[model samples]
Target chain A: GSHMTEQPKTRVSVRIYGQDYTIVGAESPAHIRLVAAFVDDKMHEFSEKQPMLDVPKLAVLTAVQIASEYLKLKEEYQRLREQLKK
Target chain B: GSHMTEQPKTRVSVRIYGQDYTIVGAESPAHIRLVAAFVDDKMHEFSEKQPMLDVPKLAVLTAVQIASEYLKLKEEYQRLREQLKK
Candidate 1:
């Protein structure tokens, strides 16, 4: 009774830095929007201090921070896993 | 006893998508460069497939993917932590 359902690679509407965006990807709407929400935080965080930085540059810088944090967190998680396994 | 000890908010030289960037941040040079390397991989990955995206858009999209992965991984890690607490 429901033709409106899930599909692959949907367009997820999200907002970053007061700007609305519709991203087409193979991720769930929830995850995609949550990602955008997180990115919005970082963008605003940077925009405050570096008011001269462009939007794309801010995004890239945010990615650098996110990527760097991801690697560090992954390492920490794996280290904890090892400690727990023993 | 060299003068090359670590300092606060170092300038990290990095390469992303055949472009060189000197990012000034509090992240270590190694982590920063590794992050840039990972980003370069993703940029090329998107460029090859999309074939028409502006570089800035490619970067923003890549940020979306990486930010999404970081959130998922963090969730898994925290869930694991909860499981191990029992």
Candidate 2:
């Protein structure tokens, strides 16, 4: 008497800063939107400090910032694992 | 006498755990490969801790771990901005 509901396919259009982008994936639309919003927030974070920075430079800076955080966290995670082994 | 070289487009095949995936994008191939390696490393990190954990759960845990780092870093960035204004 009942049927399973199909998950919505990921063909999501989102606005960031003043730009629009279409993102496609197998993940849920909400998850894609969350990631896009995070990226948009990062660009704004850069632009707010230096409004004159062009979009390309801003994007690069954001990438560098995110990479820096990722590396630091990975290092700390490994360090904690080493401690736990003791 | 030499012509300009074209940037390599992102058509990358990478292996994680025992799985292979083909990723396509406008980004340079090296960049795409680097990101894929990071994701693979994350999955291994989870699996090493709990070998019984399935791939799907490991992937979700990796996502959660990455997102946690991102949110913490973003909050710290905003805090530093506020301090600079004072």
Maximum-TM-score candidate: 1
User: What digit string (tens of lDDT, one per residue) describes model 2 on residues B1-86?
Assistant: 99887865435555544455443434444655575566668667667887335444444344434444465455465566589689
Task: Please give the TM-score that candidate 2 achieves against the real structure.
Answer: 0.38
lDDT per residue for candidate 1 within A1-86, as digits (tens), equals: 66876566556666666555556645455667668877778777887867336666666777776777677777778887799779
What is the TM-score (0 to 1) of candidate 1? 0.70
Model 1: CAPRI class: acceptable
Second chain TM-score, each model: 0.69, 0.61
DockQ of each: 0.46, 0.04
lDDT of 2 at B57: 42
Number of the predicted model whose lDDT against the real structure is largest: 1
How high is the lDDT of residue A49 in model 1?
A: 69
- Global Cα lDDT for candidate 2: 0.53
